[PDB]
Nucleic acid binder design. Structure first.
Ligand SMILES: [Mg+2]
Lengths: 52, 132, 313, 41
RNA sequence: GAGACUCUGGCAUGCUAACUAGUUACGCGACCCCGGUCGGCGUAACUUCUUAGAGGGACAAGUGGCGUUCA
């Protein structure tokens, strides 16, 4: 809003206060939920090797 | 890890070795060079080629490479060898000579020479390398 | 009896400045691109506190911003990007009114008529597209075209002569007639690729730079080459000042303003503090543009920095 | 059975092998020494 | 063989475009204190959103040590 419809000094001051507090606000969380895979009972395990 | 394959490397050496002048340091421009002159089907192949081609162009711009014969280097060797000083180092007004070469020339025909000097014997016998 | 000096600097970029565009109507307004996708719309205060403040940001390009240009009127500006296309940014509201879609390849040049009515755009595909303000490609040449590439085209400020020069990566300074619209003269002789071409205020001689790092003067009194003054380092950009009989020239690390009365370099003004003096690249000068009167020069560099160079005396 | 490449594209692809970079030898280019003209048109 | 490749994710307010996708401009109506709400109704273009074809897109791009200042 401030970068677009008014002058950009407001955008930089807001954005910099944000950068100086915390980077997750800018660096995106790309993290997403991993799928269970065939060949095991759980997510990463490949099938349970069973002695005995 | 972003490491170059032999298909990457050989392509970069062929690109810089054949068109060193067209190429340069920055990727995105000399990319335009690489896509125009060379038809790279994949954009990833194109961009990788260009990025190793760029850093390599900086290597050569920094200096001369060992294991490659640049034509420019061939011209500078012809230039350097044609470099000649004012006088040869061999031309000397006086030449020092040992007593054995004096005695041997005096027994030979070549007895008297104008610019010779039978220099003093090297006193102080310490020529052998230490044992142990 | 005068010397340039660094009046100020516009610090506001993350990647380096591919092109900066100026306008003669508003002196305290510059529109600058970067390797990031933005084009920062500055507001030049020139005050004790700060020389410039970011007013707007023309966000839109998908990827890295290649070239940006402002019209002589100054309320609008057309920019070109690796999308292929250009975008007519409304500089007050800071947003696109009309987008010019059509170019097949990277658009390396765009040119207004002297009337700021007609638009012509040149690209690396062997074509020259020609348009009205309504935005219709009236004619382009594809089959009937060059064997090699056309990297840039520009216009003559003189209205009576409808002439455009064009440099390229074929090392040839071509000259075209807008009336005939077929090349007037090619000019073989130049080794190395050419970056920029600029015409003098008088309209007698015009400078040209390239890979040679040479300001090759062509003549407008008679379409003839005259003499060359060495810019030395790759000439990324060149520009003539309107008020003076000067040639400003981006010559590697620093800017060079030659005089034509006596064919000799005067001086090269390099800042002493150069940080990259240890197995590092120095800041190579990439772009420049004179102000309206020609007392301030905006110069965009490879160190993500736009320095302005005022004439002191 | 690995089938041969052919531009025809009946038996295989039009595309050269993705690995196989058939790199051609550069043409003899003349650097122009003098600026000159042949002004016409 | 790895890599490469093919597909997917992502940058494309850009090209090509859509009543079996919607859209932005308004107005009305019941009520709450002019408006707000509504999958209650009407005014057209367009593709910003939506859908998916073609293209295009990022590369060690910047620097320091280290290294034949090479990789
Ligand atoms: Mg693989």
């Amino acid at each position: 809003y401030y970068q677009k419809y008014v002058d950009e000094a407001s955008k930089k001051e807001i954005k910099d206060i944000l950068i100086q507090y915390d980077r997750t606000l800018l660096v995106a969380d790309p993290r997403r939920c991993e799928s269970k895979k065939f060949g095991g009972p759980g997510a990463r395990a490949r099938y349970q090797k069973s002695y005995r | 890890g972003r490491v170059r394959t032999k298909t990457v490397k050989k392509a970069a050496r062929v690109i810089i070795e054949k068109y060193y002048t067209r190429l340069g340091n920055d990727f995105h421009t000399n990319k335009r060079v690489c896509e125009e002159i060379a038809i790279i089907p994949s954009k990833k192949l194109r961009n990788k080629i260009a990025g190793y081609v760029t850093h390599l162009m900086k290597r050569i711009q920094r200096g001369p490479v060992r294991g490659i014969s640049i034509k420019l280097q061939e011209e500078e060797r012809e230039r350097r060898d044609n470099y000649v000083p004012e006088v040869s180092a061999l031309d000397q007004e006086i030449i020092e000579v040992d007593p054995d070469t004096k005695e041997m020339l005096k027994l030979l025909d070549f007895g008297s020479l104008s610019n010779l000097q039978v220099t003093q014997p090297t006193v102080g016998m310490n020529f052998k390398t230490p044992r142990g | 009896t005068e010397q340039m000096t660094l009046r100020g600097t516009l610090k506001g970029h993350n990647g380096w400045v591919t092109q900066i565009a100026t306008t003669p109507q508003f002196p305290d307004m510059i529109l600058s691109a970067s390797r990031d996708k933005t084009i920062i719309m500055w507001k030049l205060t020139r005050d004790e506190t700060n020389y410039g403040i970011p007013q707007r940001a023309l966000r839109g390009h998908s990827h890295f911003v290649s070239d940006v240009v402002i019209s002589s009127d100054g309320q609008f500006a057309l920019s070109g990007s690796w999308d292929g296309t250009l975008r007519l940014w409304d500089l007050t509201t800071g947003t696109t009114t009309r987008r010019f879609v059509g170019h097949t390849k990277d658009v390396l040049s765009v040119a207004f008529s002297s009337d700021n009515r007609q638009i012509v755009s040149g690209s690396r595909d062997k074509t020259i597209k020609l348009w009205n303000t309504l935005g219709v490609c009236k004619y382009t040449v594809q089959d009937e075209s060059h064997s090699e590439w056309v990297s840039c085209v520009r216009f003559s400020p003189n209205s009576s002569n409808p002439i455009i020069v064009s440099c390229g990566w074929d090392k040839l300074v071509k000259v075209w007639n807008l009336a005939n619209c077929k090349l007037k003269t090619n000019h073989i002789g130049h080794t190395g690729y050419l970056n920029t071409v600029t015409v003098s205020p008088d309209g007698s001689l015009c400078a040209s730079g390239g890979k040679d790092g040479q300001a090759m003067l062509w003549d407008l009194n008679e379409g003839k080459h005259l003499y060359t003054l060495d810019g030395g380092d790759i000439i990324n950009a060149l520009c003539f000042s309107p008020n003076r009989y000067w040639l400003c020239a981006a010559t590697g690390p620093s800017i060079k303003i030659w005089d034509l009365e006596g064919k000799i370099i005067v001086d090269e003004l390099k800042q002493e503090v150069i940080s990259t003096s240890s197995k590092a690249e120095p800041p190579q000068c990439t772009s420049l543009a004179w102000s309206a009167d020609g007392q301030t020069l905006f110069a965009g560099y490879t160190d993500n920095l736009v320095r302005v160079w005022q004439v002191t005396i | 059975i690995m089938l041969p490449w052919d531009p025809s594209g009946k038996i295989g692809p039009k595309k050269p092998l993705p690995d196989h970079v058939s790199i051609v030898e550069p043409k003899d280019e003349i650097l122009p020494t003098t600026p000159i003209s042949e002004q016409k048109g």
